[PDB]
Amino acid sequence: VEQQFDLQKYRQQVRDISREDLEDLFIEVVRQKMAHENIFKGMIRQGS
Amino acid sequence: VEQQFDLQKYRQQVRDISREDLEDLFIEVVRQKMAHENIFKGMIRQGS
């Protein structure tokens, strides 16, 4: 629910943004979800 | 280290990508990240 709401406020925004301001928000994207894999790669690490 | 290559690599792809076409990978993303949000969360209420 709330998430769906969120994504929409970000495309409610993004639309208004700019080649580089989405560039960084985008570079920042993969600059996080890789952490959202290591910090998700540790949490599955406990499969022992 | 490695991911830092990853990063630099994801830059090139995006410093040529056009306006809207550099937008749809920011809408799919703030969906992305959140899917993990429920996942770390998922991961932390799985640990206790």
Side-chain angles (χ1 to χ4, degrees):
Chain A
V1 242
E2 168 182 282
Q3 313 209 290
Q4 313 192 11
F5 285 108
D6 238 45
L7 340 171
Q8 270 178 31
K9 352 158 126 242
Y10 293 50
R11 0 139 137 198
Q12 254 226 347
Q13 293 154 338
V14 143
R15 252 179 229 110
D16 258 13
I17 321 202
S18 96
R19 276 114 155 211
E20 268 138 304
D21 269 39
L22 305 154
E23 245 132 11
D24 313 321
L25 294 223
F26 182 75
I27 79 181
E28 291 175 342
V29 314
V30 157
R31 254 250 213 77
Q32 216 157 356
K33 281 102 102 219
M34 294 303 299
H36 288 151
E37 313 150 355
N38 319 288
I39 223 319
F40 181 58
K41 264 137 194 204
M43 288 303 324
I44 98 177
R45 256 157 221 227
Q46 246 113 16
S48 65
Chain B
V1 169
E2 251 169 85
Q3 297 144 31
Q4 301 146 10
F5 317 133
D6 239 329
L7 280 213
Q8 315 166 2
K9 300 174 124 239
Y10 296 98
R11 310 216 182 114
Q12 327 151 332
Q13 312 163 302
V14 184
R15 278 193 215 113
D16 323 271
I17 54 178
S18 59
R19 234 178 235 182
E20 348 143 286
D21 245 44
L22 157 66
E23 312 182 300
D24 269 28
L25 321 164
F26 192 82
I27 54 202
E28 303 194 341
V29 157
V30 213
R31 296 185 188 57
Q32 244 140 56
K33 333 149 117 223
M34 299 313 255
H36 308 65
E37 279 222 339
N38 261 45
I39 266 352
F40 183 57
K41 279 203 152 210
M43 260 347 251
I44 21 147
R45 2 136 106 166
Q46 262 224 50
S48 54

